Amino acid sequence: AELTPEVLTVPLNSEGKTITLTEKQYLEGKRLFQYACASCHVGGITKTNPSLDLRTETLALATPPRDNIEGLVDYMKNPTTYDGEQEIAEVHPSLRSADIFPKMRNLTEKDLVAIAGHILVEPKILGDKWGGGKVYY
Amino acid sequence: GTTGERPFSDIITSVRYWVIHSITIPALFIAGWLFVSTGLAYDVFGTPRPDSYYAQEQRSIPLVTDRFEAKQQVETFLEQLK
Amino acid sequence: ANLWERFCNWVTSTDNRLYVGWFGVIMIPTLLAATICFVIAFIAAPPVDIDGIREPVSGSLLYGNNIITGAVVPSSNAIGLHFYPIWEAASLDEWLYNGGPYQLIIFHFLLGASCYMGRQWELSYRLGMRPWICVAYSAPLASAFAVFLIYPIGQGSFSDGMPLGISGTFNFMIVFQAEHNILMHPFHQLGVAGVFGGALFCAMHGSLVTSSLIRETTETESANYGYKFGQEEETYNIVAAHGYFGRLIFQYASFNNSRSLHFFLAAWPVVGVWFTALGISTMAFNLNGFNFNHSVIDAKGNVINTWADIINRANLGMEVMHERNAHNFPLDLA
Amino acid sequence: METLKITVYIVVTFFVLLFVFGFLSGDPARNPKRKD
Amino acid sequence: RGWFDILDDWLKRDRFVFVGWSGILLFPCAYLALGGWLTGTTFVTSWYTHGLASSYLEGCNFLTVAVSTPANSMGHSLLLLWGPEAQGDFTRWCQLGGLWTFIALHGAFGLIGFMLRQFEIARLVGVRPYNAIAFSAPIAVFVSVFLIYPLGQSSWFFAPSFGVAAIFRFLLFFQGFHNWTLNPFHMMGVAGVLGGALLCAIHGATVENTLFQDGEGASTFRAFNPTQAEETYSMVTANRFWSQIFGIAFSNKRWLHFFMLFVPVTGLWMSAIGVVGLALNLRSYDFISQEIRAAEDPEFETFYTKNLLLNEGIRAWMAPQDQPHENFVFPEEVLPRGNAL
Amino acid sequence: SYPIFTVRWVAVHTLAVPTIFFLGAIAAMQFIQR
Amino acid sequence: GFAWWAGNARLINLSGKLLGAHVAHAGLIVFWAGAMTLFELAHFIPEKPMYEQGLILIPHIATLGWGVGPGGEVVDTFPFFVVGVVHLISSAVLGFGGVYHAIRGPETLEEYSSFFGYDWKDKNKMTTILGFHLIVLGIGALLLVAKAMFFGGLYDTWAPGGGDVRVITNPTLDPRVIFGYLLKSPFGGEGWIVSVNNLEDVVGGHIWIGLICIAGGIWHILTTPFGWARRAFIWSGEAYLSYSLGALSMMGFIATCFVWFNNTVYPSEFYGPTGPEASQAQAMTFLIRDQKLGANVGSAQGPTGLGKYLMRSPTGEIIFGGETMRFWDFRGPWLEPLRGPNGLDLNKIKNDIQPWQERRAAEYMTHAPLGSLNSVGGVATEINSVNFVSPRSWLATSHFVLAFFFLVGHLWHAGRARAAAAGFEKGIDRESEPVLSMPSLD
Ligand code: CLA
Ligand code: CLA
Ligand code: CLA
Ligand code: CLA
Ligand code: HEC
Ligand SMILES: CC1=C(/C=C/C(C)=C/C=C/C(C)=C/C=C/C=C(C)/C=C/C=C(C)/C=C/C2=C(C)CCCC2(C)C)C(C)(C)CCC1
Ligand SMILES: CC1=C(/C=C/C(C)=C/C=C/C(C)=C/C=C/C=C(C)/C=C/C=C(C)/C=C/C2=C(C)CCCC2(C)C)C(C)(C)CCC1
Ligand SMILES: CC1=C(/C=C/C(C)=C/C=C/C(C)=C/C=C/C=C(C)/C=C/C=C(C)/C=C/C2=C(C)CCCC2(C)C)C(C)(C)CCC1
Ligand SMILES: CCCCCCCCCCCCCCCCCC(=O)O
Ligand code: OEX
Ligand SMILES: [Cl-]
Ligand SMILES: [Cl-]
């Protein structure tokens, strides 16, 4: 198998438009995920709140839907709770809160797209493993 | 306590020794290298290349499940990627 | 002829059937205390709440154990690394419930064993010997410090130290493998090499010497009677032994110097065991064995499992089951 | 319990002092060759 | 003085590497077993038998490479290259697990050759054959573990695979499935191996610390001559030392050295027997009296009950991946799990 | 005066020759990328 | 009489070459201090916490006040560069003196100068060299005080407002406090000297030890050992080495425990959370998360009948539940705002947990000091992804190993010194075998 453009093609927005990531993007998003996110989100789970994972199906039910590049980019700038009701920048890394989460300081707009794209691609490769936890290791 | 062979420390301090073996040693290293770099090793031994463990939309292991058709089973798996 | 000099002369006397000495002044009492408490606890102690969850574990023969399953159970997780002598309990009933005997035994035993090592130096000095037998014994002793003290220090609790039991020993090593992947730790690997190799070299040396005993007896008597205690001549023929072994491999892979050979016999197991003691002692601080989990992936990013991943599956089954009522939160951080 | 604690403290101190004073009583000299 | 005696002369000549009649069996088979292992760990996969990468070529390192066992579907096939599974196709032979039987069988015959070599050299040199006798313990372990054990089970698949981590996996299998640590034949083996290591360290240390002063130098090694008739260390001082430290001591150098042979060899023979039992799943798994009480009494808990829950974690969590041919599917809700974890 | 080619010589090259060839192959291997 | 592999034993009575060795070796030590710091700085990235980055020297410097500001934010890296450079340069000076004395200088010193020359058996001269070095060391300890009190202060994790550099103006002089640490039990909730939890006590102890070291340095230059001391010890170079090996061993073990438990002089902002700290932090994290969902964390009975979130310690104190019950002796700046007199105060817990404390607990929980030898972070069953091993695990394990081997070295050389001193380190005299002149045991 290989990392074809189909696997690299992910929704850009709710309206249904899509975008095809380069492999360079995917690899760069993976590295930036490790740098900024994996300490809590290794494998697509959430160590500090296991009830919420990064599986595409969970993100699609989030309010603002997050199963797309735009949703995820926005989340990294102004994260909300799953129902959208409250902003949580104060305890979740985001550009809005890079003062207190300094790893977010050096992140450009295209970095966020890479991070977002990796999150959306990875369950297409690993399936159940991504966000499934130790049961699938 | 010797049996009449030339001492090892005699041999590898010798000029004839190194004159022959500065050729033979790199040449083998290089052969070994090319055995892999050409991809021959994969074909000789049947080892999957990184892109041929699975079909694209597939995550089943191509597991041999028969004793006397095992050889055909593997071939059936190999063609399932071409 | 002064009263204190008389005592000092009895303490260090080389004419006592067992040597006492100054290290022994500490060793005799502390080993007696440990031994007596252990024998009584192994037979009759009631169940001990090892993990502090009010889930008492039966370890003694009288409460339904046999020789293989019995243990003196580690002291309660609720105590941690706090000191729990008898006089800190409201009653002996309380001290028994919380695992006090385990603390008494291991602290006396570690002291007494440490003095055992010193006693070995000490009599070597009084007898005009060379000093380093005690250095060989430091390998086992360091190993006992690891599983009884160092590992409990690093994890925060004597409740995770090795039980004084046969099956408790096994529990310890299973749970160690899931929390530390010790098998994949090179210092455990070296200890296996010290211990397999020590047994190998034990057999080698005993068979090579035994192979080259000089005829001194008839077929109808043990050849052992061909050696007499304190004879000055060697009882085997090391040149015959060297001649066999060097042809079995090749000449320069065999010792012809007895002093080097016996030094090698001493060095190999002692050092592999040092490392394995060091292995336990550093996993006490969670510098764990190699982790190759999902290290091989294919061109798409599928995981390609290796035998390390299979190990991990086993390790998971040990992790999720151990101390099954003791975790409320997702990570077993200690 | 305090009686027991007292006793252990006294027993232990006694043995530790034997040990210290024992080794301060010319221990290097208690060997079979050169005593000094 | 015909051809057999001429060949004998030549096989038995004193050269850097002695050959003998035994060398005809030993040297090919040992070379091939070693060769097969290095070849497979460098170039050969386990994708089609195990679903595993297992060579350097594939990404594995020294700890995770292995020549893995054939697939369970091969049964106990000899998996000859010219046999009916591979049909002379070297490539398919490799992918089917052919190198495992290749190594095991040549290894077996190499061990026979090696032990014959100990017999042959001992006879030519005039010693007694106790080193050959001591080597039976390695042979018994190898045959019991690598050949007898899978022969009682369904296939070679369940034999140990030749690799560092694969063997680690073998140890863990035997805990979860066979409860092998509870086996008194394993326990005597452990006592033999540890007893031998102790004997080794304690005997070397003793000799080195009861040396006679036979030279002026601070390196005491020099002060030995291999031809001297005199014992190089005091058996009498050693005996007094140990009698007074430990209560008993050896007094007979011949018994001492025979004991060093006896202990590790006996220990390994004992464990071989236990493994024979495990070929049949004749395990020391349970204590019936404990299970009867524990079933009736939910407050009864021993280290024995605690380890069986560990064994049960191992079986359910490891079997789908470790036995792919069984197509085990365990949904999350069936996996045994403590709280939180 | 020593012979060149011996039994010893054969045993040595029997092991030495594929060792290096195998070392070459494994060295190339560190540059494979998925 | 020594072999190449015991070759340095040849230097025992060559006081000039032995100076070369000691001084050359000091230069390697200064070199490594220098080079490692420059390496750490070349790799350092300030957006990242130090403990995500493999640093062990930079955190020692930061802890002394240099280069950091409020909360441990790195403000200025130039102090780091300076420390490495100066150490580095200084190692060439030590290297030069070192190889000069070992190769070209006078082989022995005692002919060239009665002052620098020494005989190991000169109990007076040995105590004078010891006394000089004590004084040096006393000066060493005062330099720390001087920094704390006159040249900038020290990093105080406990400073209100997140931690900050703070000048120490009332160092603790009370001997009941200073020497009282020396008398606390090493066991749980006591921790002997590892429990020291404020810079006032740290700085006052160094005043004491500075003076005590100068006093004793002075004492030992003016005295010779009394007769009981003369008869208790072996007087030889190898015996002196063995004494110092014992002490370095003991000291290494102490350091191991220091870096594992102490979050005051090993601030967690820099070194990562302690094991107890991280474990406590997880219980905090899920207490916070669950209370936000509506759980009443004080009345929640867990599966064992013990509280799921909160329980009592054996002496009554309200503490976190689950396995971290073992870790209730932990104290840290993010947690103490919740402690009332009876332990964790349930009304503060319901009302006064701050975002910054939620952040800190999550961060410490997810940076617990568990990791693989190839630096995969987390429990041993975790997948690859996070490249992390806590500085505290690196520093604890390394120094436990060195402490261990230095105890073995102490036994080696102490035993050998005793035997050489008595004349049987080379073996038993065949013609005078002590045992053959004793009666038999039976
Ligand atoms: C920190 C490590 C260390 C140090 C400082 C020393 C120091 C010393 N050793 Mg020991 N030794 C060591 C490790 C060390 N050794 C180890 C590991 C071994 C085992 C292999 C030995 C084995 C050993 C033996 C067998 C002997 C010594 C001897 C000596 C002394 C004399 C050396 C001599 O004449 O050589 C001469 C060597 C040279 C002329 C070669 C060049 C060496 C120079 C110094 C290299 C420096 C390079 C450096 C980059 C220069 C920078 C210069 C700049 C700062 C100006 C010297 C004091 C000898 C002794 O005791 O004499 C009585 C001796 O017999 N040593
Ligand atoms: C503790 C280490 C040490 C010791 C004990 C000695 C001892 C000695 N040296 Mg060596 N030496 C050392 C280090 C050491 N040196 C270093 C580091 C270098 C290179 C810089 C040298 C280079 C050297 C040479 C080139 C020669 C000697 C000579 C001598 C002898 C005569 C000393 C004399 O007359 O000066 C009296 C003392 C002084 C002039 C010192 C002045 C005050 C000093 C410089 C300041 C104090 C330093 C301070 C405490 C710490 C450094 C600061 C740093 C922390 C930033 C004496 C045996 C001579 C010899 O063997 O005779 C042929 C000789 O020719 N030495
Ligand atoms: C001897 C007592 C002593 C103690 C307990 C400490 C303790 C401490 N020091 Mg201080 N320090 C000392 C001496 C001491 N230091 C001296 C002499 C100097 C000058 C060389 C310094 C210079 C210094 C600096 C520059 C810094 C510290 C730092 C620290 C702290 C962290 C380092 C650490 O964990 O070391 C743990 C301590 C030890 C391993 C020493 C234990 C010694 C044992 C208890 C006694 C051994 C006795 C010995 C065997 C001799 C016996 C003689 C015999 C006749 C009986 C820690 C609180 C750091 C700090 O405070 O940061 C703010 C720091 O940056 N210290
Ligand atoms: C490196 C540090 C060092 C070293 C190596 C020495 C070495 C020596 N000192 Mg000096 N000393 C030092 C520092 C040092 N001193 C300092 C700083 C002072 C000032 C207080 C002194 C004050 C001093 C005096 C006043 C005397 C010595 C004496 C001696 C000699 C005998 C030592 C002895 O018997 O110890 C062995 C120690 C004992 C037998 C008893 C020690 C009891 C301790 C407190 C028990 C603690 C044990 C416990 C496990 C450790 C944990 C810590 C504990 C306190 C809680 C010896 C040459 C004696 C001598 O001959 O002087 C001429 C003497 O009378 N020293
Ligand atoms: C690195 C920049 C990242 C990225 C891209 C994300 N995270 Fe986190 N995460 C954490 C917690 C506690 C939650 C739940 C918050 C809540 O709802 O209360 C989250 C949630 C997310 C989501 C949404 C998941 C969903 O199903 O909607 C996403 C897309 C996300 N995160 C991305 C905890 C942490 C961390 C602990 C300190 C850190 C670090 C990160 N997250 C980092 C990142
Ligand atoms: C199988 C087979 C066969 C055979 C084969 C063979 C015979 C092979 C061989 C091969 C070989 C023969 C190989 C080898 C290789 C080797 C190697 C690969 C090695 C390596 C090593 C190393 C790596 C080392 C290193 C080191 C270290 C690491 C440390 C210490 C030091 C040293 C240096 C040692 C045939 C043909 C019959 C056919 C069928 C099949
Ligand atoms: C004796 C001896 C020995 C040893 C020796 C020694 C150990 C030495 C030392 C030495 C040393 C110890 C050295 C040092 C050196 C150093 C140097 C020489 C440095 C320099 C520096 C520089 C040049 C700098 C620069 C810089 C800067 C300034 C900035 C930053 C960057 C840089 C880094 C570039 C031996 C064993 C071998 C042998 C025998 C004898
Ligand atoms: C700084 C500081 C501090 C303080 C400290 C101190 C003040 C110290 C002290 C310490 C000390 C003060 C110590 C001591 C020690 C001692 C010892 C270590 C001892 C030794 C001993 C011995 C070794 C002995 C021996 C012997 C015997 C017993 C018998 C006879 C013989 C002999 C001699 C061998 C604190 C913590 C607050 C905080 C932080 C900082
Ligand atoms: C004493 C025992 C020696 C036997 C060694 C085995 C001989 C070497 C075997 C070489 C076999 C290659 C033949 C494979 C091709 C067979 C084609 C087919 O299946 O019909
Ligand atoms: O105690 Mn015995 O065990 Ca070492 O982790 Mn946590 O804690 Mn419990 O859990 Mn897994
Ligand atoms: Cl358990
Ligand atoms: Cl928990």
Any chance you could write out the topology, listing elements then pairs?
This is part of a larger assembly, with seven protein chains of seven kinds.
Chain C: H1 3-11, H2 21-44, E1 71-72, H3 92-98, H4 100-126, H5 133-155, E2 164-165, H6 166-180, H7 186-211, H8 238-248, H9 258-283, E3 287-288, H10 307-321
Chain F: H1 7-29
Chain G: H1 15-43, H2 58-63, H3 78-104, H4 123-150, E1 154-156, E2 164-166, H5 175-183, H6 199-222, H7 227-232, H8 237-261, H9 268-271, H10 275-292, E3 310-312, E4 318-320, E5 339-340, E6 343-344, H11 346-351, H12 355-365, E7 371-372, H13 391-422
Antiparallel strand pairs in G: 1-2, 3-4, 5-6
Stearic acid is lined by residues 81-82, 87-88 of chain E.
PDB class: photosynthesis
Keywords: water oxidation, membrane protein, light harvesting, electron transfer, photosynthesis
Entry title: RT XFEL structure of the one-flash state of Photosystem II (1F, S2-rich) at 2.26 Angstrom resolution
What does it look like?
Chain D: One of its GO terms (biological process) is photosynthesis. Chain D: One of its GO terms (cellular component) is plasma membrane-derived thylakoid membrane. Chain D: Residues 25-36 are cytoplasmic. Chain D: The chain crosses the membrane at residues 3-24. This is part of a larger assembly, with seven protein chains of seven kinds. With 334 residues, chain C is mainly α. In chain C, 55% of the residues lie in helices and 2% in strands. Chain C contains ten helices and three strands. Chain D has 36 residues and is mainly alpha-helical. Helix content of chain D is 64%, strand content 0%. Chain E is mainly alpha-helical and 341 residues long. Chain E has one domain (23-341). Chain E contains 13 helices and two strands; from the N terminus they run αααβααααβαααααα. A two-stranded antiparallel sheet of chain E has the order 1-2. Chain E starts with a helix and ends in a 19-residue tail after the last helix. Classes of the chains: A mainly alpha (137), B mainly alpha (82), C mainly alpha (334), D mainly alpha (36), E mainly alpha (341), F mainly alpha (34), G mainly alpha (442). At the C-E interface, helix 4, helix 5, helix 6, helix 7 and helix 8 of C face helix 5, helix 6, helix 8, helix 9 and helix 10 of E. The structure holds chlorophyll A (4 copies), heme C (HEC), beta-carotene (BCR) (3 copies), stearic acid, CA-MN4-O5 cluster (OEX) and chloride ion (2 copies). One chlorophyll A binds at residues 19, 23, 90, 93-94, 96-97, 100-101, 105-106, 109, 112-113, 116 of chain G.
